[PDB]
Amino acid sequence: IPTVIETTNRGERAYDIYSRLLKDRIIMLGSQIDDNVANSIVSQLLFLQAQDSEKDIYLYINSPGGSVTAGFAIYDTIQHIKPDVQTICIGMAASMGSFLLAAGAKGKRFALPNAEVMIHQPLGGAQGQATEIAIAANHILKTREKLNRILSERTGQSIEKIQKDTDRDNFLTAEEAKEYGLIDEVMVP
Amino acid sequence: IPTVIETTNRGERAYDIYSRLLKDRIIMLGSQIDDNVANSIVSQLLFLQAQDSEKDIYLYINSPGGSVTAGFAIYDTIQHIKPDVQTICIGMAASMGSFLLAAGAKGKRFALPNAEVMIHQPLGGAQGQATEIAIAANHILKTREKLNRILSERTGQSIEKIQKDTDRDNFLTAEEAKEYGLIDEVMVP
Amino acid sequence: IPTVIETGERAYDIYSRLLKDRIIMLGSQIDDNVANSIVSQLLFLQAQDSEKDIYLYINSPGGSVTAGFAIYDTIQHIKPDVQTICIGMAASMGSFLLAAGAKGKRFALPNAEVMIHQPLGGAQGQATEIAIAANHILKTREKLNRILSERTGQSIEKIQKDTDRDNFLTAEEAKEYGLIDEVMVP
Amino acid sequence: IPTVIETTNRGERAYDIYSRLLKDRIIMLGSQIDDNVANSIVSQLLFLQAQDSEKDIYLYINSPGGSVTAGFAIYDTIQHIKPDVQTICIGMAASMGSFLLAAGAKGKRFALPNAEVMIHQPLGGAQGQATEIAIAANHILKTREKLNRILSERTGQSIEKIQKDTDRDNFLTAEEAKEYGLIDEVMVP
Amino acid sequence: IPTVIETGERAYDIYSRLLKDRIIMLGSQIDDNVANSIVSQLLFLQAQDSEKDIYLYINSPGGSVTAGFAIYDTIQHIKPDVQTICIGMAASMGSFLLAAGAKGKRFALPNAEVMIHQPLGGAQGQATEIAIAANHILKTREKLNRILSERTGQSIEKIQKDTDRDNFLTAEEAKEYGLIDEVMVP
Amino acid sequence: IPTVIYDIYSRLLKDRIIMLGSQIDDNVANSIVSQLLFLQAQDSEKDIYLYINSPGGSVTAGFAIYDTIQHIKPDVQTICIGMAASMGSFLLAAGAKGKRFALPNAEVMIHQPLGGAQGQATEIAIAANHILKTREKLNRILSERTGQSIEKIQKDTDRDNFLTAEEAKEYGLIDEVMVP
Amino acid sequence: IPTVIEERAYDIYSRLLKDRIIMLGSQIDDNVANSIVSQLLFLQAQDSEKDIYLYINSPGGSVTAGFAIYDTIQHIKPDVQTICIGMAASMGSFLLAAGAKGKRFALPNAEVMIHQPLGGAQGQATEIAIAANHILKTREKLNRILSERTGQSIEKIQKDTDRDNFLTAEEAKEYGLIDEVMVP
Amino acid sequence: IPTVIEAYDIYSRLLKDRIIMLGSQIDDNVANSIVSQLLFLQAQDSEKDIYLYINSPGGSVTAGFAIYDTIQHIKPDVQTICIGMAASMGSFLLAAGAKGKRFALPNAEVMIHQPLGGAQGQATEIAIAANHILKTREKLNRILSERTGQSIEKIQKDTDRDNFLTAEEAKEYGLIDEVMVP
Amino acid sequence: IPTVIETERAYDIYSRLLKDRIIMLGSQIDDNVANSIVSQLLFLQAQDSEKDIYLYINSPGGSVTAGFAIYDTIQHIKPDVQTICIGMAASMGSFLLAAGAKGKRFALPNAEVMIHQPLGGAQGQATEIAIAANHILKTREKLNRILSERTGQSIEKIQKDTDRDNFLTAEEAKEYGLIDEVMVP
Amino acid sequence: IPTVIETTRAYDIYSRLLKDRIIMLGSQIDDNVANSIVSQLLFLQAQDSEKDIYLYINSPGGSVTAGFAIYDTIQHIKPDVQTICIGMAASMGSFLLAAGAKGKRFALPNAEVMIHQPLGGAQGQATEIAIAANHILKTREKLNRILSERTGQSIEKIQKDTDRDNFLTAEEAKEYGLIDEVMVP
Amino acid sequence: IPTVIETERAYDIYSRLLKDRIIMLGSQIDDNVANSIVSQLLFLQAQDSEKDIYLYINSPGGSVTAGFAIYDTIQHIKPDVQTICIGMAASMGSFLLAAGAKGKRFALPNAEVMIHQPLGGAQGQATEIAIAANHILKTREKLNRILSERTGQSIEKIQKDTDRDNFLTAEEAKEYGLIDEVMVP
């Protein structure tokens, strides 16, 4: 992770690259989505709204996904702050990472021509008693419905198509993610 | 570990202790009930029936429980054979061990005065996709129903009451198990 | 694992005493060792008497498809009828072997469970090694369903739907399905 | 974890992102609650009070819960300081996270529309002597009560309802969290 | 475990040869598996002759409460008198079994020690699951105190005081206390 | 760890505040003593605030802190938040008279020290006598600081004993329960 | 592992051994190989005219251990019938093909797999060349025999074993690995 | 490593001259750094060349494409220089450089091969995994076919097993444009 | 380990072969295997000192020292010991093979034979390392000398030929002097 | 690793030494270390393509690939690169030692130099092993070739002298032509 | 490790002593430690090649190959290098002690010095073990010879005295001539 040195009339600014890009309102979501990661992303979003609440934000996405709970943390913060958030998928947006992909501002969800996108149903787990397991099964189906509902609004697909398409891992080409409504444009070079 | 050696007109007979008890139609269950334990007990019942379809069998029970699947194999085998299986609880009959205790021939279900009986829900687990967890949830619920149903038929208790009393670990004195209908007699002196 | 002695002195362990009455016990996962033993017992029992029925009590969670076919093909191969009796649970290959009992003589105890599902595999390595492996297991799926079809009376396309994920069956349901012929009462 | 560098009279001050947010009286809680996280929140609270005992504090919560003891440290300190503390749940506030969400200054507890809240009874352990197990059991029941007592004060549901409702895992949406009185408003975009 | 022989040919191990003389050696940790061995021997022995005394040598550090009662209850159940003899050590559950022998026939060798203490347990999970466990292990402390009161002559209250922490007794102090009837002199 | 390039404990330290938010081991005690000596050095009359949320730890490391509190010139206020257990509770009690506090929901626990011994009968006799001796040292100082007798303290610490903030005040472990 | 009693007391595999049946139901290592060879030597000693039946359900194993069995089969006088049940793969498949001409069977759902040998080399450049030359030399020994035993050219066997190749019992018959599929 | 705290390390010194060093396995973190460095450099100056040195065993196909598409997306030319080894995904990134500006040093090595996968589970899930990795092989081949001039058929054959190319055979293959002579 | 029952002798399989004077070596050679072979050889002599004994070999080899245990016992006893290699005779496996009775050392047509240096190791002081070094070079001469006598091949050739692993075919081992005849067909 | 501070600014001792055009290679050579060396080389070129570079070498060696990254870079840049062996230059470290500028390859009196064959590994199918074997043999030919050209020895001689571990005295490496002078004192 | 500040120079403690020409060797000697010391020595020579250098020694030792790198650099540089043993200088650590500038090798009154043979190891073929055994003896000779020159003791005597571990009191290291003066008070 390189450092960039910037000079001001007061002294030297030492920026690691992600922090220099963050000065141009660029957020890089480059790993698995978990709590520490959500906390980082949400904080960057809150910081940038403060700096300027009228300028776009660029959320670059290369994530194999992760926690649904952490993704909603991100999602909700996107839907809540004042400036538009463009999302660029580079490489891979799978599961929750493709969810945030579809969560960018209308007209402003991009993917590079070779970016891959995956939609699937969420993974959970339960041990112990018959009632414990039933509580956990009901919770996960409930969050399945929530995810399908929101995706529907975002893509324009019917909940029932989404339900069938996410039944097993479904890999989408950048061009197929446009047909699907997950992204708006494929950024051609 | 020990051995008993017997004399027959035409040679000698070396029996491990459980084998010498089997000859008198006594079966010992003193472990967790996995498939192996199940396979051995079913074999033993089938053998004892093949010797004398009339004479009683004795199944002593000191078992903390195990595979639900392996309980029913024993249970149904006990119901299938012609001889009356007398169930005697020594020490601890827990989980699927008390279920098996209740399976004994009616009138011939016993406990020693200081023997413990525990009844609870079955345990389980699922990992993976939402619809896989739903399948595992539905299944475990269906076997709770199935167990409640058989327990009800044998104890004289209602399904609702068994449903409440098994919600968490429930410990029963031998006389409490007598008063619940899990056993017939507390064997003194 | 108990012993039984009878009159030198015929000293048997419990399963071997049951073999004398033509009873085979499959009460564990089906791996290659278990297959070899069952197969061996089946051959032994044929050599003793090719006319008298054989009784295969089943309580198995399943295992190696390959090891399951060895048993399946041996049952088909020998002369004596092989009755299958499901006790407890017959899952994956267990249920498939259950269905392989001699026609009219496939039984279940009242609280026996049955489960049918897809075979389970794995592949690692080069793209074309993965291809070879996918193609192999899909080819064995077809093989499984076709035999399962013949023996249940169900269509190839129904077994495909019904085994797409874990499908837990009641004894009555398994009779309805074609996997067993009778539920044993009492 | 990214850095922000500001230009001041004195020179060039570089903050980590969470420290830039602290200057705006924002506190972020994104992890489990353990003795270190406790100490850190507490300290940020003692720090903000020192800077301005009048202006509101904003505490964002996305946490799977944790230590009853560390949670209570945070709780007591919110009550102790003069400035109002607004709690905003994003993503997940579970067990002690949700208790803390409820600890917000009345009229000023929020959730984003897809945030989840979970209430359960506390978890613990005990080993060794019968009378050592009793001391651990008595203590966990005393804290269960202390937890219920306060939740009741904070929510307006009774001590007996919370006891029934927290017996197993209980998943609430934000809208149900408003009905339960765990939060005041659901923030809409 | 060496072999003895009786002239077919009777091949024994030492415990099996002592078993012929009605001696049962309990010389290890008390788990369900070991309670099994001991219950069976007792049942077998009652079957061979319900009058002749049975000898229970005890060298155990303790073990499962429920495995202990299994043994304890079977001694009371069967007709023949069980003579308990404490060699080496008998701690906790093994000292409860020591005191469990027929009246007048609980013995210990001059240098045997005996230990009485609280039953040990463990609870994990939710507050309500900790309650159920806590109550269960208070209920079994009482049973053990209760029974031990009848067996020693000591009151419930002294036994509560006396089992609080570990408490090692001399063979002579176990006689005073009422755990054994006599210290066996050469 | 909210950080400026001052971390957050370093900012509170500037206001004479010391946080004890972990097990008491050598390093923690080193850190805390070091802070005590340093704060004494910036100003020897101004109060010190010592917050405690500590499961406890090394008797020895606790003592380094105890004697450092009594040794320096300024008063050290102890404020229990969350839980102060075993050596934490001792440290809570170790603050200046009139200035030992607990927040209304804080919990205190007192007990015996724990320890170990392996090997030869006499090596075990040395370790045994050592632990029995440090128990009396703890029980003695707790008597001088609570107002309870050394006979009532042995009674009370024999097993894990949990006190409420109000019961800690009844008992003399603290002077006040801090409100609101 | 059940017991049978005649008063003589065998385990099932030893009972079957009396009827001249050998079962090969495991990986082929040196121990399994040691035990088959011995069985075949014993059976020859018993009677040299009577056939021997080798039942096969094995995923393979050591090439060098397969050859012990292979060579022992060729060397003894009685004809060894090989029967594939379940799976005969890698070196197992080769041994199946090693049965007496006209006496190589498979059951209808048995599977056959043929592929390259597998090996390893660590160390210096020249130690790796020795291992490479060696394993290539064994690949050709295998091919050449499969060719003598199936009728297929060395060129064809070379290709058809480049990656894992799964055969139905019917394809194994068409290929020459076996003589008959055992119906019914 | 090695450091001026002014931390201002050697790679930071090189970035100042528009040199990006890739000397490790390609995973998400490495890709992120690379992409970020590529975006950073564009923002600085849009018409000056960028130098990406490649000494990589390769790695994640997905991480590789991130860099690839970033290279195609931005405005300035990205020269690729292979040093030592550029294998599987690395060789793909080598081929990815601006046309006429892809280099290798005389002793550098290049290896091309199939993508590497895995698959556990039900028959159907294995089928899904196979189809995807076959779809990613076609995709790699097809791009490499544009990039090299060689056809889809040749590339397919030539990537069947590990294929080790010298720098001079890499020029002949059209993977690089020139061998950097001293 | 299958059983064979005669009439009431109950020899397991290798024991029944021992009855026909057959000794099976089918594993690594270490102290247990060696001790077993020796005991078998001594037993067999006792029974009858004229009749040939047949030792089948399929060994990856093993301990040099355990190899000599076997070798020396073979020479010592009075019966001829014919060595048949089946499958693999590597290292100390092929030494033993070459040690059978002259004119009576065989290999089946597809058997492989590997000859190589002995492997060893040394940790510790410089002086301790030299002691271990000189030992292993001495046992290398010991093996090479015996090899020469048993093959007719010069000690110089054996020194070159075993520098790295050498993989002979049965037919090559025949040429080399390691076996007398290849057992066709 | 100790700091040095300058005024006009803290430095590593290593980047202090880099201000004097000194590069230290004091460890095993894998990609990370090569990367760092290459980068140091390219930086020093940017700072002046005229003045020489001092590359001290204390390495047990490592990756062939990573070594060749350094070797080629040294060849490529404009300035002369002096190589100085202190302590140990083994395997790929000694290949890089003989890679210094003409007349500018040195060793200290007690530096040891070791040359040997490259090491590798291969697992899987015969063909995958053949591919592996052939690639590593191709890298032997490459190494030997470049050594032959620089040391003045013949390919056939370098092959024999690197067959196993060859430890060379500093004087002996001057004889062999790996270095030019032995630095004295 | 604590920080020192100058009005702003933020030195870590070792880097403040490097300012006063003091180098601290406290750990085991390996390729990294040796690379740091060599780097520190080169640096100090460029700053002032006339002023003394102070190498404080407290080490169990480690790699011979690492130590010799430090050894060769000390002799090679212009400044005199004083070596002071604090606590312990074992094996390679005592060798460096003996390597200080004449008249300037010191020890603290309670400093302990141990000398012995180098340790090594070898696994593999007979010839592999011989090559290792050879290298280590050549290493032992070399060590012995350099220790002989520097203490003024014969090769035969150093040979005997280092056979097993030899612990020397601070004063005995002076008679034996490893150090020059023992430093009071």
Coordinates of N, CA and C in Angstrom, one line a residue, chain J residues 1-7 13-14 16-17 20 22 24-28 56 58-60 85-88 108-112 164-167 169 172 183-185, chain K residues 8-12 14-15 18 31-32 34-36 38-40 42-43 46-47 65-66 68-69 71-73 75-76 125 127-128 131-132 135 138-139 142 145-146:
Chain J
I1 N 15.6 -2.4 13.5 CA 16.4 -1.7 12.4 C 16.5 -0.2 12.7
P2 N 17.7 0.3 12.9 CA 18.0 1.6 13.4 C 17.8 2.8 12.5
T3 N 17.4 3.9 13.1 CA 17.1 5.1 12.4 C 18.3 6.1 12.3
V4 N 18.4 6.8 11.2 CA 19.4 7.9 11.2 C 18.6 9.2 10.8
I5 N 18.8 10.2 11.5 CA 18.1 11.5 11.2 C 19.1 12.5 10.6
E6 N 18.7 13.1 9.5 CA 19.4 14.3 8.9 C 18.6 15.6 9.0
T7 N 19.3 16.7 9.0 CA 18.6 18.0 9.0 C 18.9 18.8 7.8
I13 N 18.8 2.9 8.1 CA 20.2 2.7 7.7 C 20.3 2.3 6.2
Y14 N 19.3 1.5 5.8 CA 19.3 1.0 4.4 C 19.1 2.1 3.4
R16 N 19.6 5.2 4.1 CA 20.8 6.1 4.3 C 21.9 5.6 3.3
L17 N 22.1 4.3 3.4 CA 23.1 3.6 2.5 C 22.8 3.7 1.0
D20 N 24.2 6.6 -0.6 CA 25.5 6.4 -1.1 C 25.6 5.3 -2.2
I22 N 24.3 2.3 -2.2 CA 24.6 1.0 -1.6 C 23.3 0.2 -1.5
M24 N 21.8 -3.4 0.0 CA 22.1 -4.6 0.8 C 21.2 -5.8 0.5
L25 N 21.8 -6.9 0.1 CA 21.0 -8.1 -0.1 C 21.5 -9.1 0.9
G26 N 20.9 -9.1 2.1 CA 21.3 -9.9 3.2 C 20.4 -11.0 3.6
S27 N 19.6 -11.6 2.7 CA 18.6 -12.6 3.0 C 18.3 -13.6 1.9
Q28 N 17.4 -14.5 2.1 CA 16.9 -15.3 1.0 C 16.2 -14.5 -0.1
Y56 N 26.1 -5.3 -2.0 CA 26.6 -6.3 -1.1 C 25.7 -7.6 -1.0
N58 N 24.9 -11.2 0.9 CA 24.9 -12.2 1.9 C 23.7 -13.0 1.8
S59 N 23.6 -14.0 0.9 CA 22.4 -14.8 0.6 C 22.6 -16.3 0.6
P60 N 21.6 -17.1 1.2 CA 21.6 -18.5 1.0 C 21.0 -18.8 -0.4
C85 N 30.7 -9.8 -2.0 CA 30.3 -10.9 -1.2 C 31.0 -10.8 0.2
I86 N 30.1 -10.6 1.2 CA 30.5 -10.8 2.6 C 29.8 -12.0 3.1
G87 N 30.4 -12.8 4.0 CA 29.7 -13.9 4.6 C 29.5 -15.1 3.6
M88 N 28.3 -15.2 3.0 CA 27.8 -16.3 2.2 C 27.1 -15.9 1.0
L108 N 35.1 -10.5 0.3 CA 36.0 -10.4 1.5 C 36.7 -11.7 1.8
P109 N 37.9 -11.6 2.5 CA 38.8 -12.7 2.6 C 38.1 -14.0 3.1
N110 N 37.1 -13.9 4.0 CA 36.4 -15.1 4.5 C 35.0 -15.4 4.0
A111 N 34.5 -14.7 3.0 CA 33.3 -15.0 2.3 C 33.4 -16.4 1.7
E112 N 32.4 -17.2 1.9 CA 32.3 -18.5 1.2 C 31.4 -18.3 0.0
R164 N 26.5 -31.5 -7.2 CA 26.0 -31.3 -5.9 C 26.7 -30.1 -5.2
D165 N 26.5 -30.0 -3.9 CA 27.0 -28.8 -3.2 C 28.5 -28.6 -3.3
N166 N 28.9 -27.4 -3.9 CA 30.3 -27.1 -4.1 C 30.6 -25.8 -3.4
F167 N 31.2 -25.9 -2.2 CA 31.6 -24.8 -1.4 C 33.0 -24.3 -1.9
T169 N 36.1 -21.4 -1.4 CA 36.9 -20.4 -0.8 C 36.9 -19.1 -1.7
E172 N 39.5 -19.3 -4.2 CA 39.0 -20.3 -5.2 C 38.0 -19.8 -6.2
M183 N 39.0 -8.6 -1.7 CA 39.2 -7.4 -1.0 C 40.1 -7.6 0.2
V184 N 41.1 -6.8 0.3 CA 42.0 -6.8 1.4 C 42.2 -5.3 1.9
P185 N 42.5 -5.1 3.2 CA 42.6 -6.0 4.4 C 41.7 -7.1 4.4
Chain K
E8 N 12.7 18.6 15.5 CA 12.5 17.5 16.3 C 13.1 16.2 15.8
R9 N 14.1 15.7 16.5 CA 14.7 14.4 16.2 C 14.1 13.3 17.2
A10 N 13.3 12.4 16.6 CA 12.7 11.4 17.4 C 13.4 10.0 17.3
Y11 N 14.5 9.9 18.1 CA 15.3 8.7 18.0 C 14.7 7.6 18.9
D12 N 14.7 6.3 18.4 CA 14.6 5.2 19.3 C 15.9 5.0 20.0
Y14 N 18.3 2.8 20.5 CA 19.4 2.3 19.9 C 20.0 3.2 18.8
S15 N 19.1 4.0 18.2 CA 19.5 4.9 17.2 C 20.1 6.2 17.8
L18 N 23.7 5.0 18.2 CA 24.3 4.9 16.9 C 24.8 6.3 16.5
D31 N 21.3 -13.8 9.5 CA 21.5 -13.0 8.3 C 20.9 -11.6 8.4
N32 N 19.9 -11.4 9.2 CA 19.2 -10.1 9.4 C 20.0 -9.2 10.3
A34 N 23.1 -9.6 11.2 CA 24.4 -9.3 10.6 C 24.3 -8.2 9.5
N35 N 23.2 -8.2 8.8 CA 23.0 -7.2 7.7 C 22.8 -5.8 8.3
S36 N 22.2 -5.8 9.5 CA 22.0 -4.5 10.3 C 23.3 -4.0 10.8
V38 N 26.5 -4.8 9.8 CA 27.3 -4.4 8.6 C 26.8 -3.0 8.1
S39 N 25.5 -2.8 8.0 CA 24.9 -1.6 7.6 C 25.3 -0.4 8.5
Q40 N 25.3 -0.7 9.8 CA 25.6 0.3 10.8 C 27.1 0.6 10.8
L42 N 29.2 0.3 8.0 CA 29.4 1.0 6.8 C 29.1 2.5 7.0
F43 N 27.9 2.7 7.6 CA 27.4 4.1 7.8 C 28.3 4.9 8.7
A46 N 31.5 6.1 6.9 CA 31.2 7.2 6.0 C 31.1 8.6 6.7
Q47 N 30.7 8.6 8.0 CA 30.4 9.8 8.8 C 31.7 10.3 9.4
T65 N 28.2 -18.0 9.2 CA 28.3 -17.3 8.0 C 27.9 -15.8 8.2
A66 N 27.0 -15.6 9.2 CA 26.5 -14.3 9.6 C 27.7 -13.6 10.3
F68 N 30.9 -14.1 10.3 CA 32.1 -13.8 9.5 C 31.9 -12.6 8.6
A69 N 30.6 -12.3 8.2 CA 30.3 -11.1 7.5 C 30.6 -9.9 8.4
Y71 N 32.7 -10.0 10.9 CA 34.1 -10.1 11.1 C 34.9 -9.4 10.0
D72 N 34.6 -9.8 8.8 CA 35.3 -9.3 7.6 C 35.1 -7.7 7.4
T73 N 33.9 -7.2 7.8 CA 33.6 -5.8 7.7 C 34.4 -5.0 8.7
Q75 N 37.4 -5.7 10.1 CA 38.7 -5.6 9.7 C 38.9 -4.7 8.5
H76 N 37.9 -4.8 7.6 CA 37.9 -4.0 6.3 C 37.8 -2.5 6.5
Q125 N 21.9 -38.6 1.1 CA 22.8 -39.7 0.6 C 24.1 -39.7 1.2
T127 N 27.1 -39.5 -0.1 CA 27.9 -38.4 -0.7 C 27.5 -37.0 -0.2
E128 N 26.1 -36.9 0.0 CA 25.6 -35.6 0.5 C 26.1 -35.3 1.9
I131 N 30.0 -34.3 1.9 CA 30.2 -32.9 1.5 C 29.9 -31.9 2.6
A132 N 28.9 -32.3 3.4 CA 28.5 -31.5 4.6 C 29.6 -31.6 5.6
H135 N 32.6 -29.6 4.6 CA 32.5 -28.2 4.8 C 32.7 -27.8 6.2
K138 N 36.4 -27.9 7.5 CA 37.0 -26.8 6.9 C 36.7 -25.4 7.6
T139 N 35.4 -25.3 8.0 CA 34.9 -24.2 8.8 C 35.6 -24.2 10.1
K142 N 39.2 -23.1 9.8 CA 39.2 -21.6 9.5 C 39.0 -20.8 10.8
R145 N 42.0 -21.2 13.1 CA 43.1 -20.4 12.6 C 43.0 -18.9 12.9
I146 N 41.8 -18.4 12.6 CA 41.6 -16.9 12.9 C 41.6 -16.7 14.5

